[PDB]
Design a protein around this ligand. Structure first.
Ligand SMILES: [Mg+2]
Ligand SMILES: [Mg+2]
Ligand SMILES: [Mg+2]
Ligand SMILES: [Zn+2]
Ligand SMILES: [Zn+2]
Lengths: 112, 91, 77, 22, 135, 246
RNA sequence: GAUGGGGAAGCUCCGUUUCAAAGGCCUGAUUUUAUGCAGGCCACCAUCGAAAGGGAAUCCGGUUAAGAUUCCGGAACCUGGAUAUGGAUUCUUCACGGUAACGUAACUGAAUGUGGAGACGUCGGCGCGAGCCCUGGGAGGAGUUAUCUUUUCUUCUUAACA
RNA sequence: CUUGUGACGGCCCGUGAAAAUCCACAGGAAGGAAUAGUUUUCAUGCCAGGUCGUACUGAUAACCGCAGCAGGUCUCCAAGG
RNA sequence: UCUAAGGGUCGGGUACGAUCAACUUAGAACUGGUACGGACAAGGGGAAUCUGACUGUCUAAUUAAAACAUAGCAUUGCGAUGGUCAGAAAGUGAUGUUGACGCAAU
């Protein structure tokens, strides 16, 4: 039934002043300030969370290696897999559309 | 069971504000909170986000529409006469 | 603050030219209700980490004790 | 970082190539 | 009729080589024991050769005309077949089902697939196959 | 006497508009070269809600023709525009909803919105929700177009002015009763400090022309001359007629 | 709130990117050498404004008459800079594996562009976690005991970091 | 019970900050091996981290109300019946 | 002093049995100086009239109201070289990151 205190000079319950009660090896209860939780990185197109990317505060991404921040695909840590797939499909199909459009538009005015 | 005889969603307003005002508010909130057919994915998944913003939960499209309904009659007749003028401009 | 689980990697760690100090800890442990055995912890102080090797067998534990280098300052406790 | 980090990387490579120049 | 033949060129849409152009050398419509799906035994380009102009004299040309190939089993649902085609005779005998599960054989097959791709690229063949799909 | 409330409003101390949560000025794309010799295609990325505004906004992305980069313009969303729609802006643009054709190149009876007064001010007319401008006639020699405004007025503007084809989204808003002083509070809380309104007849005579008296009454006539001065213009300014017509 | 400007007899007022010739950035080249001349890149455009907003990184035990997340002992982490060794990669120069979602100790990438994080209302119910509360057995200590009570109270703990 | 969090649902003519800062992707400039290199986003190893505050009260006696004034003054923890 | 109902987890070739743990409700006897939400805690109600629709606000230190506000209704001005308002002036401002489903005045 021990009661705890803030360990810093902020006495207010702000977003950066979150505490958690822990039990020390001395057998007493003590507050422990916890940092704010990280949000998962989002896809650029669909806006959903990228799978396989570590979830850290933005300064902490400079400490981890490249494997924790990337996937082994084109647009790896940036776009979702289905978004990359559909833009590959879109790219190939409408360059083919442009080829067919170009040959038809040259052919009609070559005939006329 | 049918809990209210006639007030429906305006039953949250109690006896306040007058019955004829509550009638208009009921008629517009039913349109405001109903679901609509998505013109792209074909499902009954379009809902209002804010006034004029109608987003589909399935295919994640977002259409600009009327304040309380997804399409107003003024916009319908405007789209009809734009289509008619576009067919006339080649003829 | 790190667990090391390999004997040969522990031996090559003990001669890392920044290691000065090791400590050997004896504990009385009970794996089951009838068997009080002795556990040895070999704690090697590196420059940024403390590496602990846990040995549950006394013959292997003492064999590591003569296997320690002589320049390494050891603490028996 | 990435900017001061790339500057530190090129500084390390420049120093290394200057000493292996000799 | 069916079109997923042993000489077609496709674009991979999933995996490490997504967006890369491959040539099918060995179709398998009714799958196998280790692959219970309709698949193929494609070979493709991981690193495309770069653009070559008049300014580069022969050293940058030999540097920029390098091709890094790969060989891969892929599902048909992870392929996008195209209208073009590419002749296969030089390496259809050296890439096969037993040349996988063996890194030495994969290395040896990738060497000769690389040699074939460089000779076809230094000849004026298949500009669409050797171009990079930009997306 | 004191300085009255509408006289105090022009200093802009507490009467400035609350613009913290607004997403930018909703202007048309600038009329550079592409928009007056051909067209240009952009993309609708998202349709968003604007604080203090009844209409939604559209974030349209174009490519800069002179530099490798992307430009993001804020349009006022027309009713029917969806995300992922291609928007065409220019002289040669096809006549569809959302396109940014100039007014000289649309036929009779066209309904447009976000209309420039002069060519180049990037939208001035018919910008509130549900409003639109109708093209009433053309005049090729001395190149002007007549337009019908939302007020019913008929303007004669240049034929090089641009307008977005269709009506502004979010129409029919004012048909819903607010029902609550709290709803009016939250409505004006993001616009400006002009609410609640104390009647001037309920004041003291130091505070308003209408104030004072042993009964709440105006005193003189409430129709005020246009030549009146500041502190006098409280009432119906320059009224041609009053009363409810039948 | 300066500057460029424009008012004002003037103390000063307006304005904050404006009717301005508004600057600095990296590679280097040269090794009379200093840092100009080879280059190339970029156009925000002062500054002030939160000990409750955003934000790199520390915990436990002990210690004083009076200090401690600050001292002592132990155990960590971050930033800036130096740097060598091992590992990795390469004669197919700049890695392999998995159908795939993706995995690993690593596994060049300038200019320029794009995306993400920072970065976000309120209420309601439901799920999960931590601490506290309640409680059983057991190992210790204390209390009541005419009678009764295998009883009443108390100790049985585990930090950051990996 | 207090508190943190997750997936949701209701509400709005209210849809509920900005910047510093950090990371990734696209691109392929340039540099590159064979008797040798290239890499320090992998591991280990080396050095440094300046300035100012830091005691105590925070209220029927440490603040403001002429004062050791029943007044006023923001917030965290919260046992059993 | 009892009764009844409301569960979990394990068990079945190719209907049930075992174990464990909850406070919720309903009912029945019996009993007492008819007491029992036993202290604490805790609505007086009805029939009408005047007035303001309601929630809300104000005269800090004599007036909290029927006063003010309010949603609703209606009128007026204004298409930017503009309406209303500011400034001694200005290459000056507020509405205005605005445009008649808007702003301003009643
Ligand atoms: Mg990963
Ligand atoms: Mg106000
Ligand atoms: Mg009067
Ligand atoms: Zn995506
Ligand atoms: Zn849909």
């Amino acid at each position: 039934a021990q009661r705890v205190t803030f360990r810093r000079r902020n006495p207010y319950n702000t977003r950066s002043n979150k505490i958690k009660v822990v039990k020390t090896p001395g057998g007493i209860l003590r507050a422990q300030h916890v940092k704010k939780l990280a949000t998962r990185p989002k896809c650029g197109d669909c806006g959903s969370a990228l799978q396989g990317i570590s979830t850290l505060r933005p300064r902490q991404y400079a400490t981890v290696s490249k494997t924790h921040k990337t996937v082994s695909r084109a647009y790896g840590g940036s776009r979702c897999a289905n978004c990359v797939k559909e833009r590959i499909i879109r790219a190939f199909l409408i360059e083919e559309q442009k080829i067919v459009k170009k040959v038809v538009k040259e052919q009609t005015e070559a005939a006329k | 069971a049918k809990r209210t005889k006639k007030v429906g969603i305006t039953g949250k307003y109690g006896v306040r504000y007058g019955s004829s005002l509550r009638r208009q508010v009921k008629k517009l909130e039913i349109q405001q909170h109903a679901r609509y057919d998505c013109s792209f994915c074909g499902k009954k998944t379009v809902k209002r986000g804010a006034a004029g913003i109608w987003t589909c939960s399935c295919c994640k499209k977002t259409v600009a529409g009327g304040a309380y309904t997804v399409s107003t009659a003024a916009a319908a007749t405007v789209r009809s006469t734009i289509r008619r003028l576009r067919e006339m401009v080649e003829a | 603050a790190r667990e090391i689980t390999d004997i040969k990697q522990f031996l090559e760690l003990t001669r890392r030219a920044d290691v000065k100090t090791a400590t050997v800890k004896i504990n009385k442990k009970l794996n089951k209700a009838g068997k009080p055995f002795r556990q040895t912890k070999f704690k090697v102080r590196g420059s940024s980490s403390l590496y602990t090797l846990v040995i549950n067998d006394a013959g292997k534990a003492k064999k590591l004790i003569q296997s320690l280098p002589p320049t390494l300052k050891v603490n028996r406790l | 970082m990435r900017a001061k980090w790339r500057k530190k990387r090129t500084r390390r490579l420049k120093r290394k190539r200057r000493k292996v120049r000799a | 009729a069916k079109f997923l033949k042993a000489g077609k060129v496709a674009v991979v849409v999933r995996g490490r080589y997504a967006g890369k152009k491959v040539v099918i050398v060995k179709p398998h419509d009714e799958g196998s024991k280790s692959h219970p799906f309709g698949h193929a035994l494609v070979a493709g380009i991981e690193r495309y050769p770069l653009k070559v102009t008049k300014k580069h004299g022969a050293k940058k040309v030999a540097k920029r005309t390098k091709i890094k190939p790969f060989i891969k089993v892929v599902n048909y649902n992870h392929l996008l077949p195209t209208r073009y085609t590419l002749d296969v005779e030089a390496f259809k005998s050296v890439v096969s089902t037993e040349t996988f599960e063996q890194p030495s054989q994969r290395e040896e097959a990738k060497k000769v697939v690389k040699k074939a791709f460089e000779e076809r690229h230094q000849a004026g063949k298949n500009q669409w196959f050797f171009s990079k799909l930009r997306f | 006497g004191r300085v009255i409330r509408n006289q105090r409003k022009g200093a802009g101390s507490i009467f400035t508009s609350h613009t913290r949560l607004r997403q930018g000025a909703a202007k048309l794309r600038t009329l550079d070269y592409a928009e007056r010799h051909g067209y240009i295609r952009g993309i609708v990325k998202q349709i968003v809600h604007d604080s203090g505004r009844g209409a939604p906004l559209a974030k349209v992305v174009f490519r800069d023709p002179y530099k490798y980069r992307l430009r993001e313009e804020i349009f006022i969303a027309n009713e029917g525009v969806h995300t992922g729609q291609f928007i065409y802006a220019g002289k040669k643009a096809s006549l569809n909803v959302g396109n940014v054709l100039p007014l000289g190149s649309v036929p009779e009876g066209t309904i447009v919105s976000n209309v420039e007064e002069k060519p180049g001010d990037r939208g001035a007319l018919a910008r509130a929700s549900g409003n639109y401008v109708i093209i009433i006639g053309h005049n090729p020699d001395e190149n002007k177009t007549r337009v019908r405004l939302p007020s019913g007025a008929k303007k004669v503007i240049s034929s090089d002015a641009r307008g977005v084809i269709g009506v502004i989204a979010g129409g029919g808003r004012v048909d819903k009763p607010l029902l609550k002083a709290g709803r009016a509070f939250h409505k004006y809380r993001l616009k400006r400090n002009s609410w609640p309104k104390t009647r001037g007849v309920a004041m003291n005579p130091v505070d308003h022309p209408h104030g004072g008296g042993n009964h709440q009454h105006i005193g003189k006539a409430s129709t005020i001359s246009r030549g009146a001065v500041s502190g006098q213009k409280a009432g119906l300014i320059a009224a041609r007629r009053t009363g409810l017509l039948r």
